[PDB]
């Protein structure tokens, strides 16, 4: 195909063009230095307009003075002549949105960086669409699943609830993020893995894992090369938020993974510093609080009046040396719906995932998880907190009471239940099974280190023998006496099978 057919579409695009009377604001660029463009003239420019240069590296006008306008370079403009006619576009950072994004690695200027081809799109969603209203929205009353055992058990996520994964680096945070993405395989959950400011080899690895898992059919990965300009590198979560608003506003509940947010804060810091906007504490600009507030508040749960969808958020925040008293992990814990920690101690000490409930917390609770697991083990979170204290207390183990001996061995076997293999997303019915196996003390007399083998034997035994349990309870969400009977029955049988042997 060469010089044969497209001339008719060429004539279609030429004849029928605009020839507009569009008066535009146009600015003679004065001061470009290091990713910014302090531009002379350009009076009636809306703060937030894309500003078209000579090149095509457009830019947002963040600050503006009586003489100059603080304009960033989304796309680094490596050659911009002084005095170039840099006019704005009028519109305000709008984002084209469609369901055909479902799989394409997309850049922050809505551009497919997948290699799959350009996307047709109708709407033009704003980059700073505000949060949904106070009265308009419902409490997070409906469960959403992780596939990981411990978060579901103690510190649940709900559809609309914005739990904050947090911790030091290299402790599986992106891993548990992808795990709770590809858990969603039949839950009608769009995931938006917004990758921010890390290795493109890493984002290629995670999209490789998504292609392998099949989960890339519905998820939208917003990649960010670390070589991207810091304006784009902080802009991209707002694009991901508006793109998830596109699906939440229909009826469709969705999930988002900012990854990370600390690089967003740092890139935004760099832009604010080059803009000469004065810094607040820890050399950051003060309003990273405001930036992350506008980000995470655009992620909530709709009500029946507007579609009852949800935008449950998971902004991973990087904190160095296990600190909490760093500035951005101090802002985001105030503006999130509870936080979970990935301690290096608990990760390298085998607990994988490493969410110690002593510091991790989910601040909306069991109403955001299923009623069956609720009626089983609502109390188990505080029980494990007491076990963690008493096991710290059982360092002084000389003559332990028999009741606290039962308690420590109980919570010991419980903590051993909360170990799970790499990327094994258990059925939520199976999580109910293991949590009842723990809370009913069958494993108490059993072997304490073979509990993982007991559990895999038990889950295979029930998933073979009595799978009717799983369907009746997943159709009722309620721990009834039928569930009890099927559970204790398969428990007797597999307890026999693993006693012998």
């Amino acid at each position: 195909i060469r010089a044969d057919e497209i001339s008719k579409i060429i004539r279609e695009r030429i004849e029928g063009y605009n020839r507009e009377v569009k008066v535009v604001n146009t600015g003679t660029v004065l001061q470009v230095g290091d990713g910014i463009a302090r531009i002379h003239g350009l009076d009636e420019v809306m703060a937030g307009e894309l500003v078209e240069f000579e090149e095509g590296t457009i830019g947002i006008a963040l600050n503006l003075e009586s003489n100059n306008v603080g304009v960033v370079l989304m796309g680094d403009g490596l050659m911009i002549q002084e005095g170039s006619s840099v006019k704005a576009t009028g519109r305000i950072a709008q984002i084209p949105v469609s369901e055909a994004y479902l799989g394409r690695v997309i850049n922050a200027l809505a551009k497919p960086i997948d290699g799959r081809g350009e996307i047709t799109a109708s709407e033009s969603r704003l980059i700073e669409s505000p949060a949904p209203g106070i009265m308009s929205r419902r409490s997070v009353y409906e469960p959403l699943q992780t596939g990981l055992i411990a978060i579901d058990a103690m510190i649940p996520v709900g559809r609309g609830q914005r739990e904050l994964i947090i911790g030091d680096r290299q402790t599986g945070k992106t891993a548990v993020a992808t795990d709770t993405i590809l858990n969603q395989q039949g839950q009608n959950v769009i995931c938006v893995y917004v990758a921010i400011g890390q290795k493109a080899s890493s984002v290629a690895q995670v999209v490789t894992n998504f292609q392998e898992r099949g989960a890339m059919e519905y998820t939208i990965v917003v990649a960010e090369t670390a070589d991207s300009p810091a304006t784009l590198q902080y802009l991209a979560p707002y694009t991901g938020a508006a793109l998830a608003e596109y699906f939440m506003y229909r009826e469709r509940h969705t999930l988002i993974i900012y990854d990370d947010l600390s690089k967003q804060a740092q890139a935004y810091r760099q832009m604010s510093l080059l803009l000469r906007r004065p810094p607040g504490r820890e050399a950051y600009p003060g309003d990273v609080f405001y930036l992350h507030s506008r980000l995470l508040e655009r992620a909530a749960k709709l009500s029946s009046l507007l579609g009852e969808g949800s935008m449950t958020a998971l902004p991973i925040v990087e904190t160095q040396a296990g600190d909490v008293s760093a500035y951005i992990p101090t802002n985001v814990i105030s503006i999130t719906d509870g936080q979970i920690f990935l301690s290096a101690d608990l990760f390298n000490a085998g607990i994988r995932p490493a969410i110690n409930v002593g510091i991790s917390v989910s601040r909306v609770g069991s109403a955001a998880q299923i009623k069956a697991m609720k009626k089983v083990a609502g109390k188990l979170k505080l029980e494990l907190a007491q076990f963690a204290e008493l096991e710290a207390f059982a360092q002084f183990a000389s003559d332990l009471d028999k009741a606290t001996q039962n308690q420590l061995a109980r919570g010991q076997r419980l903590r051993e239940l909360l170990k799970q293999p790499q990327s094994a997303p258990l059925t939520v019915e199976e999580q109910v099974m293991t949590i009842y196996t723990g809370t009913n003390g069958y494993l108490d007399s059993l072997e304490l280190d073979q509990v993982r083998k007991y559990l895999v034997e038990l889950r295979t035994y029930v998933k073979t023998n009595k799978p009717e349990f799983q369907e009746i309870i997943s159709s009722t969400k309620t721990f009834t006496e039928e569930a009890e009977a099927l559970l204790k029955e398969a428990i007797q049988e597999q307890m026999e099978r693993f006693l012998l042997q």
Binding site: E44, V45, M46, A47, N63, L64, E65, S66, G70, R91, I92, E128, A131, G133, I134, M135, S136, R137, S139, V140, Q161, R277, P279, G280, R281, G286, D287, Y290, S293, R294, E297, R298, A300, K301, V324, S325, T330, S334, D337, G338, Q339, G358, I359, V361, R363, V364, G365, G378, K379, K381, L382, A385, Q386, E389, F393, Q395, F396, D401, A403, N406
Partner: protein
């Protein structure tokens, strides 16, 4: 005229110009209007703090910076901002500028009090000291509130402060027949929404028929600009002020968080051409807290009891905003990450939390001995626990070995469940009476119930229920 231009807009700071005929005073509301991105008639309200020469002025905006472009008109109202106040302004949730954000019909806006006013002098302050019981065990024991005082929740990194506010509102809103007002000051919007849902549920808002709701909801968003959050506390304070002078009833305030207010003020003051201060904040922190905690004062005309949550960043006390907030507080309750880590809720550090209304002559000279004895053995336990963690309780000598187990029972016993926290715990909570509290503690500190297991005191409302749970635990020890 008074129509001027906006010369510089940098963040939510708006450098407004004016012709030399008129340059308005400070604190005055300006409203750029009629324009948005969609050609909408969208208005943005903006008040002024600094006026930087040449008849021009840098303003802070109570709504988002999008929409308005430099070289636009401004309409000053010739006055400071005025908040619609009244009994008609109960019930509905509304804005910092007063606009009803409940999205149904607006409240009748005919009585608008100015948002910035004088603080009542102490000749007007009701010097009457009084005692308040709120039904939560460790509070009415060790940090007993003043029915009329100022009440602070020094909270940690999102631990028990807002759920404590919900519990306490649930317990005392029905109790106080006078009016009430919740101030959402940079609160999390979905948790304020959950609070609003609980007010619809418990009928304190009375969703089917309003203006009989003795509580009044006002909220300002986290996602709103710091120009909004810098004055939403002033909005709530002025609604309570109107109810404290004009209505002059018993008024209850529940603002959350005051540190959000501080952070917004610091945030915008960094931008509006002003130097920083010591860590965190603006140099105007002390005067901000002065305006607030001098206007929330129980007057001889009308009482008020303003309770408030204080989120300290990094969960400490040397932080300057709680260094002045303690100086402006009278009933301080300080939560602890450690007691939250051990699940004990409310995770109060009873060593840290005290009150002015813990005088022996004002609590009862036996209640005071109860409180002193529990604080003594508890502080000694917190003193001992480090040596415990290196040398063993069983080594640590007997005359303190009984006391460590005693206070270890004590703290978990004063962990008591809440009627809303049952979603987080499993068992529905309990409204505990202070006589029951001092009775159970007179058992424990004396050492009558030293036979009980410690986890029998875990998460229990009454000491009778603690004995019942103890018998249940002994029963399961046999079974």
């Amino acid at each position: 005229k008074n129509l001027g231009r906006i010369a510089q807009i940098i963040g939510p700071v708006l450098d407004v110009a004016f012709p030399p005929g008129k340059m308005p005073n400070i604190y005055n509301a300006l409203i750029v209007k009629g324009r948005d991105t969609a050609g909408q008639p969208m208005n943005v309200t903006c008040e002024v703090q600094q006026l930087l020469g040449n008849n021009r002025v840098r303003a802070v905006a109570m709504s988002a910076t999008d929409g308005l472009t430099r070289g636009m008109e401004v309409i000053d109202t010739g006055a400071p901002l005025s908040v619609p106040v009244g009994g008609a302004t109960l019930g509905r949730i509304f804005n910092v500028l007063g606009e009803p954000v409940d999205n149904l019909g607006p409240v009748d806006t005919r009585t608008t009090s100015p948002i910035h006013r004088s603080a009542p002098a102490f000749t007007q302050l009701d010097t009457k000291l009084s005692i308040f019981e709120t039904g939560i065990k460790v509070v009415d024991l060790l940090a007993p509130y003043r029915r009329g005082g100022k009440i602070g929740l020094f909270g940690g990194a999102g631990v028990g402060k807002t759920v404590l506010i919900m519990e306490l509102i649930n317990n005392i809103a029905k109790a106080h027949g006078g009016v009430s007002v919740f101030g959402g000051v940079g609160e999390r919007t979905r948790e304020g929404n959950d609070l609003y849902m609980e007010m619809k549920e418990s009928g304190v808002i009375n969703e089917q028929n309003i203006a009989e709701s003795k509580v009044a909801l006002v909220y300002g968003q986290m996602n709103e600009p710091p120009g909004a959050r810098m004055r939403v506390g002033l909005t709530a304070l002025t609604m309570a002020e109107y109810f404290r002078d004009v209505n002059e009833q018993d008024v209850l305030l529940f603002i959350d968080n005051i540190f959000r207010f501080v952070q917004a003020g610091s945030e915008v003051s960094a931008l509006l051409g002003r130097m920083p201060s010591a860590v965190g904040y603006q140099p105007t922190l002390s005067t901000e807290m002065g305006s607030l905690q001098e206007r929330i004062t129980s007057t001889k005309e009308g009482s008020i009891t303003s309770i408030q949550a204080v989120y300290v960043p990094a969960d400490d006390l040397t932080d300057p905003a709680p260094a002045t907030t303690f100086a402006h507080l009278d009933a301080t309750t300080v939560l602890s990450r450690g007691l939250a880590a051990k699940g004990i809720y409310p995770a109060v550090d009873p060593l840290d939390s005290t009150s002015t209304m813990l005088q022996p002559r004002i609590v009862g000279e036996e209640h005071y001995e109860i409180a002193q004895r529990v604080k003594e053995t508890l502080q000694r336990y917190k003193e001992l626990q480090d040596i415990i963690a290196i040398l063993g309780l069983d080594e640590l000598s007997e005359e303190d070995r009984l006391t460590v187990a005693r206070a270890r029972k004590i703290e978990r016993f004063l962990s008591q469940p809440f009627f809303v926290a049952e979603v987080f715990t499993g068992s529905p909570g309990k409204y505990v009476g202070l006589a029951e509290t001092i009775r159970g503690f007179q058992l424990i500190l004396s050492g009558e119930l030293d036979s009980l297991p410690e986890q029998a005191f875990y998460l229990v409302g009454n000491i009778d229920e603690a004995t019942a749970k103890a018998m249940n635990l002994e029963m399961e020890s046999k079974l």
